[PDB]
Amino acid sequence: NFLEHELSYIDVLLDKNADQATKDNLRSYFADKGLHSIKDIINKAKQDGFDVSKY
Amino acid sequence: VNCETSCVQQPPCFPLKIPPNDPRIKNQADCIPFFRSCPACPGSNITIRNQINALTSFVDASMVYGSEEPLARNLRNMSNQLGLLAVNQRFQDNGRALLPFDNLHDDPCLLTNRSARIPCFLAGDTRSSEMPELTSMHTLLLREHNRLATELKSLNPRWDGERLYQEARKIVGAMVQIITYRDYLPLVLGPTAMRKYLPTYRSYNDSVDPRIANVFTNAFRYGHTLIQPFMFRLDNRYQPMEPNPRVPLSRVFFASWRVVLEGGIDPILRGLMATPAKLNRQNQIAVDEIRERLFEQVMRIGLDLPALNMQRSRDHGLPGYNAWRRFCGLPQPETVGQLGTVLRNLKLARKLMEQYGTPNNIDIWMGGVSEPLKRKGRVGPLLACIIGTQFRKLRDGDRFWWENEGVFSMQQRQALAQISLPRIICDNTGITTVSKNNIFMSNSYPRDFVNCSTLPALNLASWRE
Amino acid sequence: CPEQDKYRTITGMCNNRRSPTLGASNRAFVRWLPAEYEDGFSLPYGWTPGVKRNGFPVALARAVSNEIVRFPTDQLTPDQERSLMFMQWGQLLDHDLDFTPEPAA
Numbered sequence: 120n121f122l123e124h125e126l127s128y129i130d131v132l133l134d135k136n137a138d139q140a141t142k143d144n145l146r147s148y149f150a151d152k153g154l155h156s157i158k159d160i161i162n163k164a165k166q167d168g169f170d171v172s173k174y
Numbered sequence: 175v176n177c178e179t180s181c182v183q184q185p186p187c188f189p190l191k192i193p194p195n196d197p198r199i200k201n202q203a204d205c206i207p208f209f210r211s212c213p214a215c216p217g218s219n220i221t222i223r224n225q226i227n228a229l230t231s232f233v234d235a236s237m238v239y240g241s242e243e244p245l246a247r248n249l250r251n252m253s254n255q256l257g258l259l260a261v262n263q264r265f266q267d268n269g270r271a272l273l274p275f276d277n278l279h280d281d282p283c284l285l286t287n288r289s290a291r292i293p294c295f296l297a298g299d300t301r302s303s304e305m306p307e308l309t310s311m312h313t314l315l316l317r318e319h320n321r322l323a324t325e326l327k328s329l330n331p332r333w334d335g336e337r338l339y340q341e342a343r344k345i346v347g348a349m350v351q352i353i354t355y356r357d358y359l360p361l362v363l364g365p366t367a368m369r370k371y372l373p374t375y376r377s378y379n380d381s382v383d384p385r386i387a388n389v390f391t392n393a394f395r396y397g398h399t400l401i402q403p404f405m406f407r408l409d410n411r412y413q414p415m416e417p418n419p420r421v422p423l424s425r426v427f428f429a430s431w432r433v434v435l436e437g438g439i440d441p442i443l444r445g446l447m448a449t450p451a452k453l454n455r456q457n458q459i460a461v462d463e464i465r466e467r468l469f470e471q472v473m474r475i476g477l478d479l480p481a482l483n484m485q486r487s488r489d490h491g492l493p494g495y496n497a498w499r500r501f502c503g504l505p506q507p508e509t510v511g512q513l514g515t516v517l518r519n520l521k522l523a524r525k526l527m528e529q530y531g532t533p534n535n536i537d538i539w540m541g542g543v544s545e546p547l548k549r550k551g552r553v554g555p556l557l558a559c560i561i562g563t564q565f566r567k568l569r570d571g572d573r574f575w576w577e578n579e580g581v582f583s584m585q586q587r588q589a590l591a592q593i594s595l596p597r598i599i600c601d602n603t604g605i606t607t608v609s610k611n612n613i614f615m616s617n618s619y620p621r622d623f624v625n626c627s628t629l630p631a632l633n634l635a636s637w638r639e
Numbered sequence: 640c641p642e643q644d645k646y647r648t649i650t651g652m653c654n655n656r657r658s659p660t661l662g663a664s665n666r667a668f669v670r671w672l673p674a675e676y677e678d679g680f681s682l683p684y685g686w687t688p689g690v691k692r693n694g695f696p697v698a699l700a701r702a703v704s705n706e707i708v709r710f711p712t713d714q715l716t717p718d719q720e721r722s723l724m725f726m727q728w729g730q731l732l733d734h735d736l737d738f739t740p741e742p743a744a
């Protein structure tokens with residue numbers, strides 16, 4: 120079950136500015152929960168009743 | 175058979191039947207919903223049914239950090255190397271963190287003020303939103319974790335997010351131990367029981383079983399006798415905070431919106447410090463807000479928390495009062511007269527016998543809370559025994575207990591001795607006036623109150639590299 | 640279990656080296672006394688109508704509540720010597736120690 124605060128991690132993954140280290144840490148955290156790409160992550164957010172229309 | 179809405183008695187439903195002349199439930203075919211606790215060994219005809227503890231029994235701040243690996247990671251801020259716990263992304267309390275929001279299918283909190291659309295909080299335990307006062311304590315500890323991690327990052331620039339998290343966690347864990355054993359338990363048990371059940375700590379003993387005993391889950395509910403029928407909020411002059419300074423409890427269960435939209439944790443914490451607890455008295459055991467109106471806003475009927483306690487003891491197969499008395503090495507009253515002596519109350523003995531027929535059958539919570547309180551304590555001998563025994567096992571049987579050699583350095587131990595719940599309140603809220611002495615005793619403003627500026631900060635110097 | 644550690648595990652696993660589940664989450668409570676069920680092994684007292692406990696009718700929990708626990712709220716006695724914080728710490732502490740799961744409906 121996707122958590123509202125995890126939406127803020129999507130934001131960091133889409134920040135072209137935020138460094139490779141931070142983004143790979145977050146990718147790793149999402150991969151641990153069975154979510155392999157940003158598309159998979161947005162999709163889980165949508166399906167758990169979050170508004171993803173920003174993406 | 176859906177236990178929330180059905181009154182049929184089929185597994186796993188054990189609904190409470192309604193007595194013939196009920197003051198509230200006028201319909202005798204109605205019931206109070208109850209789900210039997212999950213068995214350790216489902217569907218077994220060999221084993222004696224036992225229940226499960228979903229948390230670590232240790233005093234380890236698991237209600238902050240979680241007790242399962244996925245949840246523990248979820249409560250963490252994973253977007254930096256700062257070792258912080260996740261904070262709410264949409265709401266603040268005067269620039270300070272709130273708990274993150276949880277995503278339940280069937281969220282009770284949304285039911286309390288439909289228009290406000292404020293969900294339950296995510297914490298280490300699932301009950302953080304049960305009452306705003308509880309939420310406030312959770313929010314406090316989250317803040318404290320973040321402050322410690324921040325401070326440790328200054329002290330030790332080169333530590334990664336894992337190290338920062340772990341170290342802050344270890345300190346919060348120690349703080350819960352100190353407040354619990356130094357400040358709380360002496361006021362529960364009284365001096366005599368404190369000496370008997372919790373002698374001066376020697377060392378970690380690896381042969382002490384640290385598990386929660388089944389009975390403890392029921393006996394620790396003595397606390398329901400302390401519950402006041404209102405939530406009290408106080409402004410910065412410790413004056414009643416407008417409007418709704420005294421909110422009925424039946425309007426606060428799962429009311430997470432109250433925290434977010436009615437002015438944060440500050441007025442809640444002030445209410446806690448500057449209001450008396452309810453005294454448990456032999457014909458004033460528990461208030462109607464929990465006995466008649468429990469969770470009335472989120473559920474089809476108001477539950478009865480005393481009754482639930484008794485149902486639950488039966489569900490868990492707990493021995494009756496006399497068996498616990500004997501366990502504790504206390505006299506076991508056989509007659510109405512002898513129960514009169516033990517309770518120092520013949521009227522109450524008469525009433526308990528009228529319900530139960532023998533003192534052998536009195537349910538543990540009912541018998542425990544009936545006993546006269548020990549001098550300067552808030553439990554009688556039976557409960558002092560169970561509670562004391564359990565806390566002994568929690569301390570002696572914990573390898574990471576704060577005073578166990580090799581857990582902290584001596585200087586760290588000296589630094590830790592200086593912590594107090596008042597100090598924590600100061601460090602993490604807009605509150606500038608807090609309770610002196612013992613927070614759990616001090617209850618009257620202004621008489622019992624001090625400026626924050628008078629309290630020693632926790633000195634983290636001995637956590638350096 | 641590891642040999643060298645520095646921090647508690649989340650689950651409480653490995654606190655006790657010789658019996659590593661002791662205090663860990665999702666484990667059976669310990670029994671200080673043998674369990675007392677209507678049938679010896681499973682059914683709670685109160686389950687089967689007209690089945691006595693040790694010679695006596697089992698009283699309805701709600702009957703006990705009405706007759707013993709009920710009082711008028713306007714007669715409530717403030718504890719002179721304890722704050723509401725004393726109550727709250729207790730519930731908070733309880734939530735460090737034990738949660739007993741129940742099935743989802």
Ligand SMILES: *[C@@H]1O[C@H](CO[C@@H]2O[C@@H](C)[C@@H](O)[C@@H](O)[C@@H]2O)[C@@H](O[C@@H]2O[C@H](CO)[C@@H](O[C@@H]3O[C@H](CO[C@H]4O[C@H](CO)[C@@H](O)[C@H](O)[C@@H]4O)[C@@H](O)[C@H](O[C@H]4O[C@H](CO)[C@@H](O)[C@H](O)[C@@H]4O)[C@@H]3O)[C@H](O)[C@H]2NC(C)=O)[C@H](O)[C@H]1NC(C)=O
Nearest residue numbers: 371376377378379380381382383563565566567568570571
């Ligand atoms: C480390 O902790 C160990 C456990 O400590 C208990 O829990 C802590 C938190 C404290 O409350 C502590 O006081 C508790 O004892 C501890 O080991 C324990 O040591 C006691 C005392 O030596 C042992 O008790 C002896 O037990 C035997 C066996 O019978 C027992 O088991 C059956 C079934 O469960 C029961 O029916 C019995 O009542 C017992 O419980 C007895 O033979 C023996 O009694 C006989 O001898 C004494 C003394 O001569 C006479 O007075 C008696 O009448 C008897 O003739 C004791 O009762 C206990 O079993 C043991 N527990 C464990 C888990 O090993 C250890 O000593 C601590 N270490 C340090 C360094 O602190």
Ligand code: HEM
Nearest residue numbers: 305391394395397398482483486726729730733737738739
């Ligand atoms: C505002 C305070 C409190 C409640 C609201 C509240 C409610 C409950 C409920 C609903 C249960 C489950 C009832 C059942 O058997 O169906 C419950 C269980 C436990 N309590 Fe309660 N409680 C409030 C407050 C306290 C305080 C102050 C306690 C101790 C000082 C306290 C203890 C407990 C314990 C240990 C349990 C059992 C937890 C478990 O599942 O193991 N509570 N409470």
Ligand SMILES: *[C@@H]1O[C@H](CO)[C@@H](O[C@@H]2O[C@H](CO)[C@@H](O)[C@H](O)[C@H]2NC(C)=O)[C@H](O)[C@H]1NC(C)=O
Nearest residue numbers: 124127250251252253254258259260261262263
């Ligand atoms: C993880 O940590 C960072 C740093 O503390 C948090 O960022 C701050 O968030 C607030 C609320 O959105 C902003 O007003 C600040 O400007 C942020 N400051 C910094 C230092 O970046 C972040 O929100 C945290 N995330 C979680 C999930 O708790």
Ligand SMILES: *[C@@H]1O[C@H](CO)[C@@H](O[C@@H]2O[C@H](CO)[C@@H](O)[C@H](O)[C@H]2NC(C)=O)[C@H](O)[C@H]1NC(C)=O
Nearest residue numbers: 286287288289290291417418425431432435436
């Ligand atoms: C339900 O929640 C709403 C939304 O927060 C509360 O509305 C606020 O109420 C106060 C006092 O009536 C007003 O000063 C605010 O302007 C209100 N805000 C909004 C957005 O309407 C409402 O009071 C709550 N209801 C209950 C049952 O207390």
Ligand SMILES: [Ca+2]
Nearest residue numbers: 230232236735
């Ligand atoms: Ca714990």
Ligand SMILES: [Cl-]
Nearest residue numbers: 300301302304
């Ligand atoms: Cl709850």
Ligand SMILES: [Cl-]
Nearest residue numbers: 178472473474
């Ligand atoms: Cl319902």
